[PDB]
Symmetry: C2
Subunit: 380 residues, 2 copies
């Protein structure tokens, strides 16, 4: 009960989902955390500024915390605190969390995660809505899908390639399944932003798009603050992008590498949870997200989009003609200015923020929630 | 005993080295191979052509082979079949294999490996020399160092940065210590080529350089791509594909050596996947699976990977080749068509006094392993011409 009732217009039946990881799997994870090896200290791993990636000190400390302090059960209970479901789309099990309104006039919204995130990223925002409204007063339907290849969603297929457009098709079908064929809005960050762009461009039921991320180069006058943002983008694309190039070019190899040991996964993904935020996340949060990826074998399956994600498409064929909104966080990965973003769509809404990094839903949930709400109010 | 006598002009003491990996460490390796997981099958890992990297089938099969077939001891015995030594240079333990001549007129040569190689890559060539000469007749001194950070060499330092010039200085010091201050020749491939270039450019004791690899990009003042033969254009096409589809590993080594060092140190299967991909993709004819397991096990047991990649942050960035890094000394090149970045003769010629060039119809990146006879023959001809 509570926010779990499917809209009357839904053409699918509710199949409630509960996260229940067997003790054996948790025992196995713990054994592999302990028996995984740690690299000998090197000049690079002894750099306190972490300019070469995660330090020996950080990895050692996190390993110890994972073994002695981390408990999966309370996090799992939190996962299960919100309505979750699965439905089958093109032979894929598509997982989603949701808060459904009882209002007939509620605006449907799907909120789309990226890598190395998941549906969990949006739990703080869902919690804010749940605190502030009843099912009778909730102004929106809030759908948080697990994209193909992530966590409790299966896929992508083994027998054919799968890309960004395929991801968009699945999200659009899910929204139609839930009864939102008459119209929905998309909120997207990271890879979810590109999926959101494709929904805005190519799918009629998508009526508007709000993004908190746009990776673009100079479009075919700038303030010092804007130039700083461009400098950060350039550093990310030149010094911070090797992981993405590996995902793009050799997904099978890196998939196997990070599946081999949970310490491998922690190092690779943990680096990004450290570097990509404004204010440091709790170490517990990093362990939760990494453990979630480990236990669902997310990494090797989720990275399929990189070979497409990594010419002026945004100003032409991928221009968002529908109402387009943007939330700018200064410590995001590629903080391009408003004037650049405006060339990529019908930008009718732009929110600037003084603080916050890449994981906006985790770092600045109140700002992202209120920005999104304001955008919907303006355009719907 | 044979070929193990230091030259009379050597200043340092011979400290014979024997590879003797404790049983406990071999047991630890097999435990961690067994404990290691593999990815669930994916579209990418089921591609027979391996265009997305190592396949599920290959990794599964290699893991089983590593557990049920592989024995370190015969390989270790092969390692110990040639003279090996260590010496200390700048506080680093520098390991090297060698065949020393008893001839006073013997030409000193150091042969330089790269990544993910090691001194072992030159063993087939050392074997050919030992089969064909006695210490009394061997025309060359053949020194095969382990570069700082690889296998039985220690380093690089924990308390300061270390780069390509530092590597060059270590190699030059080793050759001087062994008595070759009056002159030596460098043979290099991969990262060793760039070390060799620096030796040719800035070290007086280095008298000539032979390379089988050049990391250069297109020369600004020509010759143009249009001037190249159809075959040479194909080479540029391969080089370009390598630099754009094949180079992500190098970018990770350069930008995030600490992260990737920890990642591959965590599990021997992680190391096998990352390095094995290159032993699969970079060769002409496939190597025996046993060879891949030997090389990966060697890296694992010596914690090579996190230490060896220090050079990438300097090597990846690399008109320097035509100007400041031009080799003015006699410069030779051996071209293998399935190497990573097969730039043509007319491009290589802009980067040094290229007095010697040899093409080959076959062979990939690991020239010393793949085409030892050809590389040995080229080196010998080069020395005869220039020394």
């Amino acid at each position: 009960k509570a926010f779990a009732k499917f809209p009357s217009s839904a053409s699918i039946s509710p199949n409630p989902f509960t996260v229940s990881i067997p003790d054996e799997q948790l025992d196995d994870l713990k054994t592999l955390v302990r028996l995984s090896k740690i690299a000998p200290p090197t000049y690079e791993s002894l750099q306190a500024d972490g300019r070469f990636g995660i330090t020996s000190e950080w990895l050692t400390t996190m390993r110890e915390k994972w073994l002695s302090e981390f408990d999966w059960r309370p996090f799992e209970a939190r996962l299960n605190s919100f309505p979750q479901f699965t439905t089958e789309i093109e032979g894929l099990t598509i997982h989603f969390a949701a808060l459904f309104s009882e209002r007939e006039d509620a605006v449907p919204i799907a909120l789309l995660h990226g890598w190395p995130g998941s549906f969990v990223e949006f739990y703080p925002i869902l919690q804010l809505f749940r605190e502030e409204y009843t099912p009778e007063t909730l102004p929106f339907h809030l759908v948080v899908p697990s994209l193909p290849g992530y966590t409790f969603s299966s896929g992508p297929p083994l027998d054919k390639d799968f890309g960004l457009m395929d991801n968009a098709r699945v999200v659009d079908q899910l929204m139609k399944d839930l009864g939102f064929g008459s119209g929905y809005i998309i909120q997207g960050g990271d890879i979810g932003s590109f999926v959101g762009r494709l929904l805005g461009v190519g799918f009629d039921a998508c009526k508007a798009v709000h993004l908190n991320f746009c990776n673009m180069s100079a479009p075919p006058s700038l303030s010092a603050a804007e130039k700083e943002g461009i400098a950060r983008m350039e550093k990310f694309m030149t010094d911070g992008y090797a992981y993405a190039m590996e995902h793009s070019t050799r997904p099978s190899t890196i998939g196997h590498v990070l599946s081999s040991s949970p310490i491998a996964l922690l190092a690779w993904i943990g680096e990004k949870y450290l570097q990509w935020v404004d204010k440091p996340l709790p170490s517990e949060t990093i362990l939760e997200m990494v453990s979630l990826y480990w236990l669902t074998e997310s990494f090797p399956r989720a990275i399929h989009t990189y070979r497409e994600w990594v010419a002026t498409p945004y100003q032409k064929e991928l221009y968002i003609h529908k109402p387009f909104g943007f939330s700018f966080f200064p410590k995001d990965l590629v903080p391009v200015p408003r004037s650049w973003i405006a060339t990529t769509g019908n930008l009718v809404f732009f929110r600037d923020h003084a603080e916050g990094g890449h994981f906006a839903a985790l770092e600045r949930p109140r700002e992202l929630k209120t920005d999104l709400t304001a955008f919907v109010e303006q355009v719907w």
